[PDB]
Scaffold this active site. Structure first.
Site, short mmCIF file in Angstrom:
data_model
loop_
_atom_site.label_atom_id
_atom_site.label_comp_id
_atom_site.label_asym_id
_atom_site.label_seq_id
_atom_site.Cartn_x
_atom_site.Cartn_y
_atom_site.Cartn_z
N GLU A 151 -16.67 -3.44 -0.43
CA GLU A 151 -15.48 -4.19 -0.04
C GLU A 151 -15.13 -3.91 1.42
O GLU A 151 -14.84 -4.85 2.16
CB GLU A 151 -14.31 -3.84 -0.94
CG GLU A 151 -13.23 -4.91 -1.05
CD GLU A 151 -11.79 -4.35 -1.13
OE1 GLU A 151 -11.59 -3.16 -0.80
OE2 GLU A 151 -10.87 -5.12 -1.51
N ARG B 168 3.05 -2.00 1.92
CA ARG B 168 4.37 -2.55 1.54
C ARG B 168 4.70 -2.36 0.07
O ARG B 168 5.88 -2.24 -0.30
CB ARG B 168 4.56 -4.02 1.97
CG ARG B 168 3.35 -4.91 1.73
CD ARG B 168 3.70 -6.37 1.48
NE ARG B 168 4.17 -6.44 0.11
CZ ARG B 168 3.57 -7.06 -0.89
NH1 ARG B 168 2.46 -7.74 -0.70
NH2 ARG B 168 4.14 -6.98 -2.07
N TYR C 65 -8.43 -9.86 4.13
CA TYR C 65 -8.46 -8.87 5.20
C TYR C 65 -9.56 -9.03 6.25
O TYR C 65 -9.43 -8.52 7.36
CB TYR C 65 -8.48 -7.46 4.60
CG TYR C 65 -7.20 -7.09 3.81
CD1 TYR C 65 -6.00 -6.76 4.48
CD2 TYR C 65 -7.20 -7.07 2.43
CE1 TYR C 65 -4.86 -6.40 3.77
CE2 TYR C 65 -6.07 -6.73 1.72
CZ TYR C 65 -4.89 -6.40 2.38
OH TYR C 65 -3.77 -6.07 1.66
N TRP D 124 -12.51 -9.04 -6.53
CA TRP D 124 -11.75 -10.21 -6.04
C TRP D 124 -12.07 -11.49 -6.79
O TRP D 124 -11.58 -12.56 -6.43
CB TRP D 124 -12.02 -10.44 -4.54
CG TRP D 124 -11.33 -9.48 -3.64
CD1 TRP D 124 -11.78 -8.24 -3.25
CD2 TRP D 124 -10.07 -9.68 -2.98
NE1 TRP D 124 -10.87 -7.65 -2.40
CE2 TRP D 124 -9.81 -8.51 -2.22
CE3 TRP D 124 -9.14 -10.72 -2.96
CZ2 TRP D 124 -8.65 -8.37 -1.43
CZ3 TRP D 124 -7.97 -10.57 -2.18
CH2 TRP D 124 -7.75 -9.41 -1.43
N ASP E 100 0.73 -0.14 -6.42
CA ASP E 100 0.48 0.19 -7.79
C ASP E 100 -0.12 1.62 -7.84
O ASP E 100 -1.29 1.84 -7.53
CB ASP E 100 -0.48 -0.88 -8.32
CG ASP E 100 -0.84 -0.71 -9.78
OD1 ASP E 100 -0.80 0.42 -10.34
OD2 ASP E 100 -1.26 -1.73 -10.36
N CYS F 72 -0.77 -6.38 0.93
CA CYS F 72 -0.07 -5.14 0.61
C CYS F 72 -0.34 -4.10 1.64
O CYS F 72 0.48 -3.21 1.85
CB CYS F 72 -0.54 -4.56 -0.72
SG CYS F 72 -0.16 -5.53 -2.14
C1 LIG Z 1 -5.84 -6.68 -3.12
C2 LIG Z 1 -6.66 -7.13 -4.30
C3 LIG Z 1 -6.94 -8.48 -4.45
C4 LIG Z 1 -7.70 -8.93 -5.52
C5 LIG Z 1 -8.17 -8.06 -6.49
C6 LIG Z 1 -7.90 -6.71 -6.34
C7 LIG Z 1 -7.15 -6.24 -5.26
C8 LIG Z 1 -7.09 -4.78 -5.50
O1 LIG Z 1 -6.48 -3.98 -4.72
N1 LIG Z 1 -7.77 -4.46 -6.62
C9 LIG Z 1 -7.91 -3.23 -7.15
C10 LIG Z 1 -8.56 -2.99 -8.38
C11 LIG Z 1 -8.69 -1.73 -8.96
C12 LIG Z 1 -9.40 -1.43 -10.24
C13 LIG Z 1 -8.92 -0.40 -11.06
C14 LIG Z 1 -9.56 -0.09 -12.26
C15 LIG Z 1 -10.70 -0.80 -12.63
C16 LIG Z 1 -11.19 -1.82 -11.81
C17 LIG Z 1 -10.55 -2.13 -10.62
C18 LIG Z 1 -8.16 -0.64 -8.30
C19 LIG Z 1 -7.50 -0.82 -7.11
C20 LIG Z 1 -7.38 -2.07 -6.55
O2 LIG Z 1 -6.71 -2.11 -5.36
C21 LIG Z 1 -8.24 -5.61 -7.13
O3 LIG Z 1 -8.95 -5.72 -8.21
O1 LIG Z 2 -4.60 -3.32 -2.54
C1 LIG Z 2 -3.66 -3.42 -3.34
C2 LIG Z 2 -3.25 -4.68 -3.77
C3 LIG Z 2 -2.20 -4.80 -4.69
N1 LIG Z 2 -1.55 -3.67 -5.14
C4 LIG Z 2 -0.49 -3.82 -6.14
C5 LIG Z 2 0.93 -3.50 -5.71
C6 LIG Z 2 1.71 -4.41 -6.64
O2 LIG Z 2 1.85 -3.79 -7.90
C7 LIG Z 2 0.83 -5.62 -6.81
C8 LIG Z 2 1.15 -6.65 -5.73
O3 LIG Z 2 2.29 -7.39 -6.09
P1 LIG Z 2 3.42 -7.73 -5.00
O4 LIG Z 2 3.80 -6.48 -4.30
O5 LIG Z 2 2.88 -8.73 -4.00
O6 LIG Z 2 4.68 -8.23 -5.66
O7 LIG Z 2 -0.49 -5.15 -6.63
C9 LIG Z 2 -1.97 -2.41 -4.72
O8 LIG Z 2 -1.41 -1.40 -5.14
N2 LIG Z 2 -3.01 -2.27 -3.81
#
Ligand SMILES: Cc1cccc2c1C(=O)N(c1cc(-c3ccccc3)ccc1O)C2=O
Ligand SMILES: O=c1ccn([C@H]2C[C@H](O)[C@@H](COP(=O)(O)O)O2)c(=O)[nH]1
Ligand SMILES: Cc1cccc2c1C(=O)N(c1cc(-c3ccccc3)ccc1O)C2=O
Ligand SMILES: O=c1ccn([C@H]2C[C@H](O)[C@@H](COP(=O)(O)O)O2)c(=O)[nH]1
Lengths: 313, 313
Positions: free
Chosen positions: B60, B216, B144, B82, B219, B196
């Site tokens: 990625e 910003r 990005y 993605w 999770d 984010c």
């Molecule tokens: C910003 C964006 C956009 C599309 C899709 C994803 C994200 C993204 O941030 N992630 C993500 C996935 C996992 C994850 C966790 C357990 C299992 C598999 C994947 C962990 C952290 C991540 O940030 C996306 O899948």
């Molecule tokens: O790279 C990333 C992309 C998304 N999120 C999480 C944060 C939020 O829980 C959700 C995004 O939702 P909004 O903040 O846009 O409402 O995904 C992450 O932690 N890391």
């Protein structure tokens, strides 16, 4: 005390900061990545251990909040905080005739300082009373008023970034996208000052509005006190308009630094003892902050130690 | 241990976080304004207490570093991070015919999950081998890669924001303007996901490159571990290209939150004991990171506890 985190920051850069070269060829002691919190329920974070003129804060923030970029409004409030930037384009312009004004701000630090104060009085009165001059040399352009309220778009238009985020807070308070940005990748490579106040973010949970500023670089002695009050004020103002109580102001720093020639001034201040924090009074009967005037904002019980001398950073 | 600050963050939101509604109608426990530091001299911040597939991180970040925005490259590395965003524009498009795919990601959480995995396999192979399809439904647009390397300007052009900042670090290492921004005020009001990872900032003092991310919203269970490694990797990569040693990664958060349905998963993990941190190995003989391939980056001694189940946030 409410301002302790400011005093700990100064003291951290004092003890564990490292020497870093800078753009201005002063020396700095510097740290990268820092975070202070101010609980706004407790009172207003105007440093008591060093005088910060709140009149100056509020007139500048109102300038910003109106989308204004012309020194004239500042001048009508005898706010000389941005004068030197406007002067820049007067001195160096194809319309300037007079004594030498190269390095003006730099060499004004002992006989030059007399004729400089002279041309700056001619520049201020002229901007005040000569509209066409004002338009050419009084207008700063890409400063925080345009960025917040008139952001230029690829399609020729102009976006009211801060206006729109307020409606968002009103309508989706729990949104994690409540960002106002001052950083334009198209503009930063050639602008006079890429904004130090790069980006801020609002947050609402259980009746309280908070704000976090990402400040890319911070003059601890001169800039920071002023910067805390501006953005703590904005927090109150936006809370006021949205009918919310006030949470925290969180100041986050990239390069938080102490200029080399502000070391004694900072040691002087650390020996001062914080006084009870002033309290902010906003107009209870007016709520639309873009229509706010100076009298709409009042600070009660502000009780600072004197101002401390500097050389300008 | 190197990952302790991650474990303290989870534990802080556990104990002192407040319930906050969110955009997705899960519940969250939330805090606003937080800051972790990782000393990169000490080893690599890939959590050992929960498996994070580094292969996924690196493919990625390389996608990003090439300015790529098409799911195809990810797919060739079996990186399905993605996929669901690209699927979005296939299902809802004027070219889709098949079984119901509304709420696809939402309702896939028990019999629907069988036919969904079916259409997603037809979508992936198609993007892999059908160029015109790939172009229409594989390309994500404002993700990005474009923001960092092809930022669209008001004048019709496109700016290599990250390329330019690297030359700046090379040429003015002590500059406090080394910002890369993913936040476009013109684009955020209608985009699928406003980034984010809003903004990051480089810093050089005495042979060491550091980076601070302003995230910003975060999770904590699913996003953060992945996000720490991406940006700690980028720190190493940029240091490598500039001939610098590695400093700190500083993770700064707006809304750092624990989804309501990740509470048991987080309690499970906090009872795990961090293992010695892996160490990062970069190609000593290649330095131009935009020309980096998967084999150019290797992680040594990574030793994670198993992956933990979720419902997807
Ligand atoms: C910003 C964006 C956009 C599309 C899709 C994803 C994200 C993204 O941030 N992630 C993500 C996935 C996992 C994850 C966790 C357990 C299992 C598999 C994947 C962990 C952290 C991540 O940030 C996306 O899948
Ligand atoms: O790279 C990333 C992309 C998304 N999120 C999480 C944060 C939020 O829980 C959700 C995004 O939702 P909004 O903040 O846009 O409402 O995904 C992450 O932690 N890391
Ligand atoms: C961003 C920008 C642009 C032009 C001009 C100024 C600033 C600015 O931030 N300030 C400033 C001045 C003082 C100050 C300190 C002691 C005395 C008088 C003024 C304190 C904090 C400040 O941020 C400018 O003057
Ligand atoms: O509102 C402001 C504006 C400027 N500065 C300081 C930080 C730096 O010392 C200097 C800006 O120089 P650069 O970071 O752009 O190099 O002014 C502040 O602290 N607050």
């Amino acid at each position: 005390m409410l301002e302790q985190p400011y005093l700990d920051l100064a003291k951290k850069v004092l003890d564990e900061g490292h020497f870093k070269p800078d753009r201005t060829h002063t020396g700095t002691y510097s740290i990268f990545g820092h975070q202070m919190r101010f609980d706004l329920s407790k009172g207003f974070p105007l440093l008591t251990t060093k005088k910060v003129p709140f009149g100056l804060i509020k007139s500048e923030l109102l300038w910003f909040l109106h989308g204004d970029t012309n020194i004239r409004f500042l001048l009508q409030h005898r706010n000389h905080i941005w004068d030197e930037w406007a002067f820049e384009k007067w001195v160096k312009s194809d319309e300037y005739h007079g004594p030498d004004m190269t390095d003006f701000g730099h060499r004004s630090q002992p006989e030059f300082a007399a004729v400089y104060h002279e041309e700056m009085a001619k520049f201020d009165d002229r901007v005040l009373h000569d509209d066409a001059f004002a338009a050419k040399y009084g207008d700063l352009g890409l400063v925080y008023g345009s960025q917040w309220r008139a952001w230029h778009t690829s399609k020729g238009d102009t976006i009211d970034q801060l206006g729109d985020v307020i409606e968002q807070i009103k309508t989706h308070p729990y949104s994690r996208r409540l960002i106002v940005s001052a950083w334009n990748p198209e503009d930063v490579p050639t602008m006079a000052l890429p904004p130090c106040h790069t980006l801020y973010q609002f947050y609402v949970n259980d009746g309280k509005l908070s704000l976090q500023l990402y400040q890319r670089s911070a003059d601890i002695f001169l800039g920071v006190p002023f910067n805390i009050a501006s953005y703590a004020l904005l927090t109150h103002l936006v809370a006021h308009e949205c009918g919310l109580e006030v949470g925290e102001f969180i100041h986050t720093f990239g390069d938080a630094h102490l200029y080399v020639n502000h070391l004694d001034q900072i040691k002087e201040q650390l020996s001062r003892t914080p006084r009870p924090a002033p309290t902010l009074q906003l107009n209870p009967d007016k709520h639309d902050i873009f229509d706010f005037d100076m009298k709409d904002i009042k600070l009660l019980n502000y009780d600072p130690y004197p101002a401390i001398k500097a050389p300008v950073a």
